[PDB]
Design a protein around this ligand. Structure first.
Ligand SMILES: *[C@@H]1O[C@H](CO)[C@@H](O[C@@H]2O[C@H](CO)[C@@H](O)[C@H](O)[C@H]2NC(C)=O)[C@H](O)[C@H]1NC(C)=O
Ligand SMILES: *[C@@H]1O[C@H](CO)[C@@H](O[C@@H]2O[C@H](CO)[C@@H](O)[C@H](O)[C@H]2NC(C)=O)[C@H](O)[C@H]1NC(C)=O
Ligand SMILES: *[C@@H]1O[C@H](CO)[C@@H](O)[C@H](O)[C@H]1NC(C)=O
Ligand SMILES: *[C@@H]1O[C@H](CO)[C@@H](O)[C@H](O)[C@H]1NC(C)=O
Ligand SMILES: *[C@@H]1O[C@H](CO)[C@@H](O)[C@H](O)[C@H]1NC(C)=O
Lengths: 319, 170, 170, 169, 320, 323
């Protein structure tokens, strides 16, 4: 005969389950995932700045003027990118240069040693090779000039540049090591030669290492590539009696603390993100992520978790 | 389970109560139905919401480019790098996994508690003017219409007003 | 204790009750003795085992060599490697130590909760027909034989059946 | 609160009670006043300080010179070093933050539990010889003086020696 | 008629700490801290390690006569008392890197890359021994290299190439000798002002003898520097010298394996299996934490400096 | 007749956050975050730092005329440079493995400077009394590093130089030397006569051959030439030999040392004091039992963990409801 007031709790049609230290697979009325497990499958801008995509080339091929190849948040290379160095040899401190170029604001290519007036006593046209072909013709890097003797003589060259860009200047050059004596004389005349490069910080002398190495792109000789960063007010000096692949174009740039290089075939797109992955971008709301351990930007922490469901509601008991 | 209410003495939940987490089902002369307690429900919402945003917003992430490139004569430092990434990996996986198990258990206990307190808060008002028939239900000794019911639901219950009558039907 | 029972208003344990974690000591005519509530005990065993398994199984670590070798001109990177190893050591040591301190307290609150719940499950059934003589005991106001006790433990105590007798002995 | 006492059925705290965390306020024919329950206030103090000490003393760190110097051609390992310091920064910042959040919750719940346990303790004594008039207050169904008012506080109260007076009221 | 609620107590003396109180005696508990090991060096992934006995990696890979010695191994073991390496004093270039890269191989084959009998018809390949690298007390040399000297007062320019027709990386090691005096240079190589050039498709370096009297080490005032490189499948490596070249004789085709480690311990190796190795012994545990050793190899529990990590399972023990 | 069970309240305005609620007032509470430091550079584990004043490590170790040369304690727990330390390699050049040296010198339990090659008796066939330059001025006069000697030709010939040092000291010896690279052939002859030269330096573990690299480089401190600096550690009982036909800046003073583990280098204007600490920061020492700190990420010693947190209010009392 009694009137009744019952106290109770909400139940619904939810099938969400969570795990607790005490029990597994507990169905709950409401929950949320702490684990971000979805990405937009795109390479987007970071901090609203687009990445630098290198097309089919790598950084060497791009930074040297390989015939076949303003600011950015990171760099993208495709896994099947072509060789950068066409003429075989060593790119000294290559990983470091890549790292230091990974992210920059302000970046300007300029002709540091103008081709027309910088080398009156040397030939700046004949320096082409079958190693660096372009449209059926022997060619060479655009950013360097392979100087050779003009009419049977190669005089001592001495050339200096003063950095008047209010920022670092990247300068790259090559050192040529002919395969044999004849090639040495054919190119530079002098037989026994040296190259010297020095700034207020950098200083190195080079001498050709004449030898017949395994043929790579029809070259038994070798070309080694070098770079340095000239501080704003500083001067850099080149001196040579042969074998010097001089700078033509250099790069004034402002380096940012640093990001990285993403090597992926994932398409680049006009989107924004705070966290980039090689597989695609992820919107950083959640604290954890299982897309990819290799990320760039302000990212969730990578975990090997498949599910991180956080209970917000109570145990669901419809019965 | 920690507070004995949910899946305890109140064995099951109500699909009929669709406007709140905790509430009542009344049954009087004027009719019956479900009604979620808005106070305790909104408070639980504000707090579980604060809980979620806490586990999320306290994750200050530094700007980092995880990837590194090493050449063939740098396997050692490459492996050091690996050890660093793998070390952070195991640390975050383990903590995230436990954080969720542990917090999920606290969350359920928290709701269990909220129900327990709601039951015993109603029980302190009614006292002996009703009987605890179980399953989280109260069978009044007096006649409790709508205005009477709502007075119980929202704190302002008048016990002395029904002391006379309650005593009779016993 | 957080729930008041263990080492609280129930001051000591029962070595006699060798059959489980929580139980009852009944005394009427016919006989007496200890008996564990296997139901709340098996549940407790299951859940605590899942707790221990949770702390263990959630590790699952990466394959790593840890050891690195550096020469006399690689002291900076050797010292970085060391910072990594020590960093992980301070993290895992502090985390392990706290996990055990925190979860141990939780486990105790849990046993305490299971007892408090048992005690309240009995209290709500009896009500008038018995006296809450403290220390966790209830003195009946009516003859309560084996099937009566078993009834209270089983949650199907028939209050009306003994209502009449109970009142009189009061 | 988790135990429904603090800010629950006992709405507020007592500024007037200064010698303890939890306690009593008596009001008999003789007089009134506040009096903290020593044994329980002390235990809570023993256990909280232990909680504070434990959180502090378990942190036993290695001797470490964090700093590193790398030249202009060691940018990669410089950044690796940055990743280590940053990773430790994120792990410890998050852990410290949540540790405090979760333990603050537990501490407040702890006190709430102690209050309730004390209340249920005296309720376990004044059984039939008193009425729970609410707000954590008992109103004696008989008449209690100072000597009696201290038997309840010490756990030696005597129910049978009042059961006769109480039965009539 | 009474009915009471209660909890179990037993003869347990186990103790655990809680955040609120230390030394709590509980009825039941469990240890989360692995502190036991088997004092053995065991197998990883079912694969036994490479034990080098009294020799180090340098003396083993170079063919030091004192190390006469599988085709696979999960890691390398060096005894703390392993002197036997570079018997002829000099600089071993990128030695640490080589050690690391040899820590685990899934396949390993020693082959004669430049057969001794047919490779050097214009040079002497028999007088290349020294008291610094003795075999049974007699002047000897690395078994895997050959110290070429002039023949009949003449050291012709030598030029020899190898093409990697193997289906894997080939490890090639060689040396460059530096006589202490011009008299020795001429006595050994004749030519006085010589050079050594080594180059593959990746590698390229020129070597010039550096002649000076340096502090005697194993009675030698001169020095010999050791070099190595991995030749990729299909690639070619070319050696060219007018003197001072210590040519390859044996090289190693190999399949490098993820990345393992090198344990330097006196701990005996046995016929046991493990997933986690320590220099002090193997860890066979399912527990998440460990205090045996920080430097482990494999799938191991985390290292902590805890002495005790006891987890409560039961409740506070109060027999009374 | 009433009895009541209640809880404490007070004037306290302290506030803490819980996972469930923000800014909850509480009766009592402590901070888990160390946010204070003493604004001093202290002795670490009871040993004073080495403070280099207006010199950097290079200038000190080489004996730049502006630096104070031992003097210099026989031990230190770490090194302090000021951000304004200007005097290092007054003669422009490259300092090989510089960072390694700085790290390896960061903490030493024993350190002694000694004249490895007495200026007077060591070089009878060369001139050891003209090696000074305007790049390294002193009391308003040409000068040079105190621990090196710039050997020049005697009269008009520079004979083959050969000198060794055996380590009779009971511990490692740090030896430093230079290689001079003149700007021109004429300067080369003017200094060392011989137009083509070499330098050799070897011990039982170290070996390197140097060849002068003559070129006109950008003028730094009026020098178009360069001077590279090298170092190595000669273990007890071993010998180091120098051989040269020119271009060798010979050691004059070397250093007997016993290096400790770890430690680092602090670059700061923060004053050095006669205080003791277990945790040092570039801006001040940390004295605390607290497990967390937000003073500075770069610390030396047994320190609290660095965090970005601004506060870590840990409740001890109860929810404060004075009402
Ligand atoms: C130029 O790029 C080619 C690929 O386009 C490179 O070929 C790879 O060589 C490396 C080893 O050096 C292997 O790991 C890859 O498997 C090769 N790719 C294939 C499938 O052929 C080549 O190395 C590059 N050449 C130069 C001059 O650097
Ligand atoms: C030490 O550094 C000081 C500057 O702090 C140098 O002093 C300058 O020297 C140049 C060159 O002679 C003078 O023209 C200036 O007048 C000096 N400036 C000051 C502030 O006095 C000094 O050359 C350095 N000494 C060495 C040897 O490194
Ligand atoms: C990209 O996002 C950033 C902020 O994340 C913003 O500054 C920028 O304007 C955005 N660009 C576009 C195209 O939305
Ligand atoms: C125990 O309770 C169940 C219903 O939950 C009932 O079917 C059974 O008969 C009861 N046992 C006893 C002892 O009455
Ligand atoms: C650390 O603080 C204590 C006071 O808490 C003080 O007595 C002591 O001198 C301090 N130690 C140092 C070296 O600053």
């Amino acid at each position: 005969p009694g009137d009744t007031l019952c106290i109770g709790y909400h139940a619904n049609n939810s099938t969400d389950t969570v795990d607790t230290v005490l029990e597994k697979n507990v169905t709950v009325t409401h929950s949320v995932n702490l684990l971000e497990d979805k990405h937009n499958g795109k390479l987007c801008k970071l901090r609203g700045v687009a990445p630098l995509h290198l097309g089919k080339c790598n950084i060497a091929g791009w930074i040297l003027g390989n015939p076949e190849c303003s600011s950015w948040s990171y760099i993208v290379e495709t896994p099947s990118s072509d060789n950068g160095t066409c003429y075989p040899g060593d790119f000294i401190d290559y990983e470091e240069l890549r790292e230091q170029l990974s992210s920059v604001s302000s970046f300007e290519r300029f002709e540091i040693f103008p081709k027309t007036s910088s080398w009156p006593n040397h030939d700046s046209n004949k320096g082409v090779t079958a190693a660096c072909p372009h449209a059926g013709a022997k060619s060479f890097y655009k950013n360097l000039i392979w100087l050779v003797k003009k009419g049977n003589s190669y005089p001592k060259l001495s050339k200096s540049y003063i950095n008047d860009k209010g920022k670092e200047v990247l300068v790259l050059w090559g050192i040529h090591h002919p395969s044999t004596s004849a090639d040495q004389q054919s190119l530079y005349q002098n037989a026994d030669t040296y190259v010297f490069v020095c700034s207020s910080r950098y200083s190195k002398k080079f001498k050709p290492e004449i030898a017949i190495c395994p043929k790579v792109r029809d070259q038994e000789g070798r070309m080694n590539y070098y770079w340095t960063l000239v501080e704003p007010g500083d001067k850099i000096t080149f001196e040579a009696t042969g074998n010097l692949v001089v700078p033509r174009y250099a790069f004034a740039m402002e380096r940012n603390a640093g990001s990285g290089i993403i090597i992926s075939d994932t398409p680049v797109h006009d989107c924004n993100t705070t966290c980039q992955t090689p597989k695609g971008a992820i919107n950083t709301s959640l604290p954890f992520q299982n897309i990819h351990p290799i990320t760039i930007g302000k990212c969730p922490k990578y975990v090997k978790s498949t599910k991180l469901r956080l209970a917000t509601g109570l145990r669901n008991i419809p019965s | 389970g920690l507070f004995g209410a949910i899946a305890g003495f109140i064995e099951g939940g109500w699909t009929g109560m669709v406007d709140g987490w905790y509430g009542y089902h009344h049954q009087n002369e004027q009719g019956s139905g479900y009604a979620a307690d808005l106070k305790s429900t909104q408070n639980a919402i504000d707090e579980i919401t604060n809980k979620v945003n806490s586990v999320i917003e306290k994750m200050n992430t530094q700007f980092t480019a995880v990837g590194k490139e090493f050449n063939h004569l740098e396997k050692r430092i490459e492996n050091l790098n690996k050890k660093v990434d793998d070390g952070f990996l195991d640390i975050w996986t383990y903590n995230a996994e436990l954080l969720v198990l542990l917090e999920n258990e606290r969350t359920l206990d928290y709701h269990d508690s909220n129900v327990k307190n709601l039951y015993e808060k109603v029980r302190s008002q009614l006292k002996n003017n009703a009987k605890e028939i179980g399953n989280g239900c109260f069978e009044f000794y007096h006649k409790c219409d709508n205005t009477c019911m709502e007075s119980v639901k929202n704190g302002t219950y008048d016990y002395p007003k029904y002391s006379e009558e309650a005593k009779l039907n016993r």
